[PDB]
Design a protein around this nucleic acid. Structure first.
Length: 70
DNA sequence: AAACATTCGTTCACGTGAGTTCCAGTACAAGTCTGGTC
């Protein structure tokens, strides 16, 4: 019901997944995904799946996010 | 001298133009789903 991951850790794990896919090593992808699964809650994992597939469906336009930012 | 007609300022109802609020139609842009091959 509670996670123990920070944003930097998640970015590092995703970077490892991408790089190891580029290098044709699936064991490291499995290890990174296992760490993410073991150190995350169900909601966090749902959002991680959405981020991996690259579709969040927030309902707010990218232009709106940029306008809010600056 | 008395009765009737006309005129006048008033009154009401009804119709038309301009201002304001609300909603439907239109336009455009982004998001989402799909197709095909290498």
């Amino acid at each position: 019901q509670k996670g123990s991951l920070t944003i930097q850790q998640v970015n590092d794990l995703l970077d490892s997944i991408a790089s190891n896919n580029s290098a044709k090593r699936k064991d490291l992808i499995k290890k990174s995904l296992l760490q993410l699964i073991t150190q995350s809650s169900a909601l966090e994992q749902k959002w991680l799946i959405r981020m991996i597939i690259k579709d969040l469906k927030l309902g707010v336009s990218q232009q709106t996010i940029f306008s809010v930012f600056h």
